[PDB]
Each structure stands twice: as structure tokens, then as C-alpha cells.
């Protein structure tokens, strides 16, 4: 439940006898954790809010000019000085102008002309800072079992529902227990500070559109820049790159503004994440969190019930998710109170020997009135199989055909692994990380190689690194020395970055 | 030269940069620098102000 259709979910199975499982949560997909004898719990990150950001260095992307003025001097007399040059609100440029006997001053050298123009800014974009403290993550988890198909994305007063829980996680309280009534409580220790880089990301606003911008792109930008506190009549310490002092001929000088600049910033931003704002807080919808799951206080509600023997009707019928699982929504006719639904994948209906794996929870209908609804999902075997629901001589059976042999599943698993590593960097080694010694060695050497690779390359974008990938591919292909492998290795890294976006 | 009423400002470890309102005057010399702050001066963080 809550993860049936997300199309980017991965199953985390097994643990050290039920002690704990490492899990990385991402915004795109969700993780369904299944234990040996415990209810399957689906966990998903929802939104990451940032709070009380502190404004820093707001820029100007649209200038406005005002009453120009100018002053000139004799070929020998010195340099021009307008009385408006002693004001920090005027742009002033000094140049040389042809003069003599025609304009009014007798001598024929070049003169000196100063022009000044007042600067007014309509619109400005501001950049705000984000400390990795006071950063709140909101995790939503739900459980399989007894909820009918309707309650998959239904967001309501989930405090009462008893099957779905919501957890806030902040650097001031990284540990939390989600109390699932009657199922126990899922303990969840999580690391919020190391989530996503939040010491290099400014929150940038232009006009009701907010981005996450990398610092060192919000400092090497050439526009009139204030600094921090907006108090009264602002002052911009630039007076250049937004006013163009175009010269005429025969001592004519003109001042123009460049227009509105909000088109170069929208295209200068490419590959910077989007965000949205609510009140004083900023909701980012793209992030990365790593929570260790201490699921040793989860129980099974269904056990010790007696199994229902009335009838079962397949109403919505069986359906196939993107990963192979099979969701079934059954309706129970009998009035047998709380009860245990018998369901098993089976082939060779002569002797129903359970095959496949039942990734549900403790199956069980909790309603007691007349007709109840339930939804359970099964992981079927690759060949043809029969979904069997019911006890005896009134068993409803459905025919199911799953496509791809185990080799296909292994290849798709390795593709998922490559994508996850390319996206998450070193941390990807912690996905199903019960944690041994081999996994830790892998994490270490991948961390070293990652630091080196990010220090050499990683100042390049899609096209540029496709280029350097092909070039290093050739160079390694015909170098004839022993370093060829090294160069060829580089290609993989670089080229794989391109074919996973 | 002769000098006059000095003034200063400082705004934290993680905020923007200091700005006096007397920087928008063409009669004042102004210099911007970094100072150690945090837990003894008023702002909780420890970088350079």
C-alpha cells in the first residue's frame, strides 16, 4: 500500500535475524521493507522543508535610468567634474572628446567629457542561505494487510486510520518511533545532516519562482549586487555591466540600459533544482535521506485467527505492476468477524504446493459486517501460475503469466544498481546494508575514487564529458602501454554518467 | 588628512555581509573584513564573521 504503482520502488528484504536494516530513502521512489515474520512496511519521503533562511546578497536584473547630465573641459583645462559624481546613486563615465574653435574653447587637443545618470532598479533577485540545521524532513510510512485498494493515495486524517503514520525528522531529533496501533512501532534512526550537500546551496528567488542554486554560481554572477540588509535607499556596488556608455563622434556621449536581463538568468540556470515556498519556509521536492530501520518491535495482527470459510469474489480483479508483483482485490461474503484469508500462488492444481512468494503482510480482513474488501499483492513465479484464494471446493482461481526469466531480473537489478550508484555517489553502498566487511571495503574504496573523480572531472556537463569520454576512449584504445586499462576505466565512469540521465 | 566619527558593523557567521548606511556617502572610507565570532559575541555559529 502506498507503493503499488510508484514505478521506482525497490524491495529491501532480510536482516540480521530481525535486528535492523539500512535503507536510503529518495524523493523519486519508495522502499517496501519485508522481514521474515513481520508485516511489510512501505516507507516514502514526501517533502523536505527548510526554515528561517537568512538573506544574502540580492542582485538586480532590470535597470532604469534617469536624468542624464554632462560636463566638458578645455583641451588643457583638466578633467571634467560634475557635482553629481559625489553621490552613490549615479553612474559616471569619463572620456575624451574632440573640441576647438567651433564649440567654444580655443585650442585643438582632445577635451574631457563626463556623463552621469541616475540608477533605479525595478525587480531584484535574492539569494538566501541554508544551514544544514533547522532542516525538517517528513517521512510517511504505511503497512500492508487489511486496507482495501481505495486507501492507496488517500490522504485524510491519517491519525485515526491506525495503519499509516507520519514522522518528522530534524537534526535536533534524528531518532523517531512510528507507532502503528496493533502492529507495534517501527523504530527509525536517520541521518539528516548528511542528506544533500546543504552547505553550498542558496535558495534563489526572482519573482514567485524559487530555485536551489549552487553557491559559486551565486557569487560569480556579473550584475549589480547589494549585500544583505535592505534599509532605505539602496546602493549597488557595481555601476557596471548593466549600463552601457556608448560613445558618439565629435564629443557626443550617450548612456543606455541593458534590458531586463531575466532571460539570461533563466538560461544560465540549467541543472539547478526547482523548489517552492510556503510562507517563510521552503519546500524542496527533490532530496535524499538515509534512515536505518530498527524493526524489532513489529508484530503480526493476523496470527491466531481462524481462517475464513465462506466464499471469495474477485471484484477489481488481478493486475500487474511494473516490477512483476500482482495486486488482487478480494471481497468476502461471509459474516465471520476478524478472520484470516488463505491465499497462495500455485501451479499444478492437483497438489497445491506453495510456490512463489506472498509479499503481503499477515493477510486478514478486519471488518465483520456483511461484505468486506481486502487487497493483497503476490510475487508470482516466472512460469504460468494460478492465484488461489479460498479453502475448499469454493476456491476462486485466476491464471497468471509472468514474462521474464531470472537472467532478465538479474540484468535489470544490475541496471538499477548502476543508476542508483550514479545518482547517489558513495552512499549507494548503504541501500540494503545489513553491513559486513565486504560492503564496508567497497564503500571505502568507492569513496576514495569518488573524491578523486569529482576533483579532476566534474567541472563538465553532459556534452563536454561525452566529448572527453570519447577522447579518452580513443587514447586508451591505442596507447599500447600498460595504462590503457586505466584510461578505459575512466570512460565507463564518464560515459555512464551520460546514459543514465 | 584628518579623520572623524568611526563606525562599524558586523553581521554574523552565516548571514550576508556587513552594510553601514554610511557606505552610500562619498565622504566616508570603508573597509570590509572577516572577524572571529560565536558563543562569546552573540551569534550561535562559529565561522568567520
Amino acid at each position: 500500500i502506498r507503493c503499488i504503482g510508484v514505478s521506482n520502488r525497490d524491495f529491501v528484504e532480510g536482516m540480521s535475524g530481525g535486528t535492523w536494516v539500512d535503507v536510503v530513502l529518495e524523493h523519486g521512489g519508495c522502499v517496501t521493507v519485508m522481514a521474515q515474520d513481520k508485516p511489510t512496511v512501505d516507507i516514502e519521503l514526501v517533502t523536505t522543508t527548510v526554515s528561517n533562511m537568512a538573506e544574502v546578497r540580492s542582485y538586480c536584473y532590470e535597470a532604469s535610468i534617469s536624468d542624464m547630465a554632462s560636463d566638458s573641459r578645455c583641451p588643457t583645462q583638466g578633467e571634467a567634474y560634475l557635482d553629481k559624481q559625489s553621490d552613490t546613486q549615479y553612474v559616471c563615465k569619463r572620456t575624451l572628446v574632440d573640441r576647438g574653435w567651433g564649440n567654444g574653447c580655443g585650442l585643438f587637443g582632445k577635451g574631457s567629457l563626463v556623463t552621469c545618470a541616475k540608477f533605479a532598479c525595478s525587480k531584484k533577485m535574492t539569494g538566501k542561505s541554508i544551514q544544514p540545521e533547522n532542516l525538517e524532513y517528513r517521512i510517511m510510512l504505511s503497512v500492508h494487510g487489511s486496507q482495501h485498494s481505495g486507501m492507496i493515495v488517500n490522504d485524510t486524517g491519517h491519525e485515526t486510520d491506525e495503519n499509516r503514520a507520519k514522522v518528522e525528522i530534524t537534526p535536533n531529533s534524528p531518532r523517531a518511533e512510528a507507532t502503528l496501533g496493533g502492529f507495534g512501532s517501527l523504530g527509525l534512526d536517520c541521518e539528516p545532516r548528511t542528506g544533500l550537500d546543504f552547505s553550498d546551496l542558496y535558495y534563489l528567488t526572482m519573482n514567485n519562482k524559487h530555485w536551489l542554486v549552487h553557491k559559486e554560481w551565486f557569487h560569480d554572477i556579473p550584475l549589480p549586487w547589494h549585500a544583505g540588509a535592505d534599509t532605505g535607499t539602496p546602493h549597488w556596488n557595481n555601476k557596471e555591466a548593466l549600463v552601457e556608455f556608448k560613445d558618439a563622434h565629435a564629443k557626443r556621449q550617450t548612456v543606455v540600459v541593458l534590458g531586463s536581463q531575466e532571460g539570461a538568468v533563466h538560461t544560465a540556470l540549467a541543472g539547478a533544482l526547482e523548489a517552492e515556498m510556503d510562507g517563510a519556509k521552503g519546500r524542496l521536492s527533490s532530496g535524499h535521506l538515509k534512515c536505518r530501520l530498527k524493526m524489532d518491535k513489529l508484530r503480526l495482527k493476523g496470527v491466531s485467527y481462524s481462517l475464513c470459510t465462506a466464499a471469495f469474489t474477485f471484484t477489481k480483479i488481478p493486475a500487474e505492476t511494473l516490477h512483476g508483483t500482482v495486486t488482487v482485490e478480494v471481497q468476502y461474503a461471509g459474516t465471520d468477524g476478524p478472520c484470516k484469508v488463505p491465499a497462495q500462488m500455485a501451479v499444478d492444481m492437483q497438489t497445491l504446493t506453495p510456490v512463489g512468494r506472498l509479499i503481503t503482510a499477515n493477510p486478514v480482513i478486519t471488518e465483520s459486517t456483511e461484505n468486506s474488501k481486502m487487497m493483497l499483492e503476490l510475487d508470482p513465479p516466472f512460469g504460468d501460475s494460478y492465484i488461489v484464494i479460498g479453502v475448499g471446493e469454493k476456491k476462486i482461481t485466476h491464471h497468471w503469466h509472468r514474462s521474464g526469466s531470472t537472467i532478465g531480473k538479474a540484468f535489470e537489478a544490475t541496471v538499477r544498481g548502476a543508476k542508483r550508484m550514479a545518482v547517489l555517489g558513495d552512499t549507494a553502498w548503504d541501500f540494503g546494508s545489513v553491513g559486513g566487511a565486504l560492503n564496508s571495503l567497497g564503500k571505502g574504496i568507492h569513496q576514495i575514487f569518488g573524491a578523486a573523480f569529482k576533483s579532476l572531472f566534474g567541472g563538465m556537463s553532459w556534452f563536454s564529458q561525452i566529448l572527453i569520454g570519447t577522447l579518452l576512449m580513443w587514447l586508451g584504445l591505442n596507447t599500447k602501454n600498460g595504462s590503457i586499462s586505466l584510461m578505459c576505466l575512466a570512460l565507463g565512469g564518464v560515459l555512464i554518467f551520460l546514459s543514465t540521465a | 588628512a584628518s579623520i572623524s566619527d568611526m563606525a562599524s558593523d558586523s553581521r554574523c557567521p552565516t548571514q550576508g555581509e556587513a552594510y553601514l548606511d554610511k557606505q552610500s556617502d562619498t565622504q566616508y572610507v570603508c573597509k570590509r573584513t572577516l572577524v572571529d565570532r560565536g558563543w562569546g559575541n552573540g551569534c550561535g555559529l562559529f565561522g568567520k564573521g
Partner: antibody, heavy 131, light 101 residues
Framework: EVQLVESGGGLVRPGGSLRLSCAASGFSYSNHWMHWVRQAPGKGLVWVSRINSDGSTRNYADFVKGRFTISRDNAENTLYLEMNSLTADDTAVYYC?????????????????????????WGQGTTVTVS | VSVSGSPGQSITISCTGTSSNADTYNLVSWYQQRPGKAPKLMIYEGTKRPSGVSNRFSASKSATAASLTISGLQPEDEADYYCCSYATSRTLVFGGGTKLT
């Protein structure tokens, strides 16, 4: 308890100069911000100026376009307000104020933007009459 | 400008600045001046009350104005009340004042 005492207020002609003083005792004067506030007869309170512990930072309101000059001597626990080119609009009672909330920052030096404050320790105020 | 109250009742004095960063009221301070007395501060940092000031006085703040609430009015309470805050980063400004009878 701390007691602040004003001095130097008196009648002076329009355009005259006047030096107000404030004597403090009973606290770490060398570490607190000091304020000068005024209140015209029958009028409300009007903030005038503020200074730090060492005297580095000095802030003045808009109505004082450089007419006032605030200073202090920590070794003598003394505050001063020089006044030049007095007009009739400034005839009022001047209150000397201690700033202890800043004393968060026991140094009283760093003049952060929008720092917390609240003025509870006031002198009795001295009357200046420009007539 | 003024507010009237009866003994035992509660009165609220408001303080509003126009278009100031929507931050200011977090730092508004409230001061009391009885007739012919030196001013005394009742509230600082918007809502915090000093030690020694009676619990009778309370304070509240929003993104648009600040409010000072006095419940169980006493004949002592009749005085002039002034709010103060930052005009800019380096300034201070007192309100128009309210005469509470």
C-alpha cells in the same frame, strides 16, 4: 541598584551649544550600550542616539543631522552628549538610558543588525530650554 | 491615542508600523510612563516580560502588529504607554503613545 544621574541641562539661546552629561554607578559601565532619549514638554518619547562600550559605534536619529555628538569615558563611568546649533524644537527632557539586554553579548562592542533590546534603566532626565 | 477601561477588565493597546520587512514586531518593546514618573519598561523582545514586572501585563505579536494586554485593570495602570522598535538596522523609534485612563 543602578542609578543614572543627568547633568548640564539649562537655558540657552537659539543657536547655542550645550553639553549634557550622565553619571552611572553600580554596574559594568564599560560593557553596556548607552542611549540618549528625549521627550518634549507634553509630548511623547523620542529616541535620539546610542553608543557602544568602547565608543567605536555611534548611531544618531534622522532629526540630528550631525548636530549631536555622543561620547563616553568608561574609566570615569561618564556619558556625554555635545550639542551644537540648538533650535527651539529640541527644548525637552533628556533621559540617559542603560542597555543591559545586549549585556547575549557581554562585550557590548559588536553592533549586529536588529539585535534584541529593551530599555528599562533610565535616568531622571535633565531639562534643556532653548528660549 | 487613548483607551478607557474599568477596574478588573482587560485592555489591549496596539502598535503598527507600515511596511517594515514583516520582521520588526519580533523586537518591539513596551514601556510604561506614569504621570510625572520616569519611564519603565514592561515588555521586551516582543513578548518577554522582565522579572519584577507584574504578571498582570502580557504581550502578543503578529506579522502585522503587536498588542499589549492588561487584565484586571487597576487605578495604577492609568499612564502613557509607548512601543519602540528598529526603524532600520541602526536606529530606534518610539510610537505615538497611548494614554490609558
Amino acid at each position: 541598584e543602578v542609578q543614572l544621574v543627568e547633568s548640564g541641562g539649562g537655558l540657552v539661546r537659539p543657536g547655542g551649544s550645550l553639553r549634557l552629561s550622565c553619571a552611572a554607578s553600580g554596574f559594568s559601565y564599560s560593557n553596556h550600550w548607552m542611549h540618549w532619549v528625549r521627550q518634549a514638554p507634553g509630548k511623547g518619547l523620542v529616541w535620539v542616539s546610542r553608543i557602544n562600550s568602547d565608543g567605536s559605534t555611534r548611531n544618531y536619529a534622522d532629526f540630528v543631522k550631525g548636530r549631536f555628538t555622543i561620547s563616553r569615558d568608561n574609566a570615569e563611568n561618564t556619558l556625554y552628549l555635545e550639542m551644537n546649533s540648538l533650535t527651539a524644537d529640541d527644548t525637552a527632557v533628556y533621559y540617559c538610558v542603560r542597555d543591559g539586554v545586549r549585556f547575549y553579548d557581554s562585550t557590548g562592542y559588536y553592533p549586529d543588525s536588529f539585535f534584541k533590546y529593551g530599555m528599562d534603566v533610565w535616568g531622571q532626565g535633565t531639562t534643556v530650554t532653548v528660549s | 491615542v487613548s483607551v478607557s477601561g474599568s477596574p478588573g477588565q482587560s485592555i489591549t493597546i496596539s502598535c503598527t508600523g507600515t511596511s517594515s520587512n514583516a520582521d520588526t514586531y519580533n523586537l518591539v518593546s513596551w514601556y510604561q510612563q506614569r504621570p510625572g514618573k520616569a519611564p519603565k519598561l514592561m515588555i521586551y523582545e516582543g513578548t518577554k516580560r522582565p522579572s519584577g514586572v507584574s504578571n498582570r501585563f502580557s504581550a502578543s505579536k503578529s506579522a502585522t502588529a503587536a498588542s499589549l494586554t492588561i487584565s484586571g485593570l487597576q487605578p495604577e495602570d492609568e499612564a502613557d504607554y509607548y512601543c519602540c522598535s528598529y526603524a532600520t538596522s541602526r536606529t530606534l523609534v518610539f510610537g505615538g503613545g497611548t494614554k490609558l485612563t
